[model samples]
Target: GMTEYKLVVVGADGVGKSALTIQLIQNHFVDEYDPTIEDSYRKQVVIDGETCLLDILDTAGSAMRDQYMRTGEGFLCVFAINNTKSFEDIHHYREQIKRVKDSEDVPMVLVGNKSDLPSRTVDTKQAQDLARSYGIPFIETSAKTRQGVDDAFYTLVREIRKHK
Candidate 1:
């Protein structure tokens, strides 16, 4: 029997959330694409020598929006390192999911995007520290360079499946 898990990518506008999702599904960078309310992507992923099906939801800038449907799913709270303000309110999204799930130990990941861009704002240590505090995983990624994007999802997938 195969197991299925739903993972959501969420963040502020212009955080490259959709770009990351596209890269994850297509392995191709999309410079521009319209956002879908809830885009579902199906894939068979292997991690830690275990294979499972993954259903990713690209929830276009609505993770913390009004009327969010956040419950019983893994979260990828993404932010751009170049934009300090982009990730400033990340705590809100994290709390939103935790509250919906009614558990602080929900499987989640803190993704720092635009890794290839310069003028660095969010430090790796700072992000790791925040993730550490929240008990989640943290990873820096670049949609342009496609750096660490796959790993981010892989880490989140492991978090959601590790206990199963």
Candidate 2:
């Protein structure tokens, strides 16, 4: 049977949330240099050999904290390797996820994006430890190079199916 699932991409401004979403859905990189201001919502994807729908929500960095407090759910939190500050915000993001989700078991993944670049602050070990602390899976990805992007989303979908 087919089912629908929702996912959100969240992180600080210029952390490449939109880039990750664009790479996943359109299979291309966005050349624009400006940061994402408002939430970009899209419903486009099929995963796990099932006709599942994906709703990727990209929110403004500053406003997202407040907005997500009201309506964050079914989302995978994303952080960029080049941005250490964004990685530090995972604690708050995880709390937001728990707040909006119907339960603590709701599907979610922690993504360390922009893996093609040398990390300015957070490293793989740090990210893995954070994911482990929250009991979520972690994957490092580079949307520009298209490395680990597909696997990250597919892994999340598989986890969703397992828990569903």
Candidate 3:
């Protein structure tokens, strides 16, 4: 049987959520901008022979607490290497996921983006530790270099398939 699943990408402001979406969909990077005007839409990805649709919800971190209370099942939490605040705010994102997701067992992936630049504050160790505590997969990616971006989504799909 085939199931259509929705995956949401969420995080604090300036964590490169749109950049990741662009990398995954358009295979290009865009300039940083005010998160308020970012677009939110659905995109599809073929993973492990299954077609899954990712309903990427790019919300302003300032308004996400209320808006994300109504988000759907699956989610991918994104953080940027250059922003420590976004990294620390991941706990809130996780809490929101717990609230919105249909099941406590819902699938999630922790993304540490902006791997192309030197980490200003958030490092891989902190990201990995958080992911471990949450029992989810983690990857550090770069939209500029396109490094580890594909693996992040593919690994997430693999995890989802295992549970399915």
lDDT of each: 0.80, 0.73, 0.74
- The digit string of per-residue lDDT tens for model 3 on 1-164 reads 24555556778877877777777777677675534344565557677676776655655563555455454445778888898888888888888667655457767899988888875688688889999998998888887889988887667666767777
The count of residue-pair clashes in candidate 1 stands at: 0
Q: Taking the tens digit of each residue's C-alpha lDDT, what string does model 1 give over 20-76?
A: 887777777856564532447777977766677888877766545433445446888
lDDT of 3 at 48: 65
TM-scores vs. true structure, each candidate: 0.87, 0.81, 0.80
lDDT of 2 by residue, 40-108 (tens): 545445675688666557766635455654453455678888888889888787776666553677667
Q: Which ten residues in a row have the lowest lDDT in candidate 1?
A: 63-72
The best candidate in terms of lDDT: 1
Inter-residue clash pairs, candidate 2: 8-75
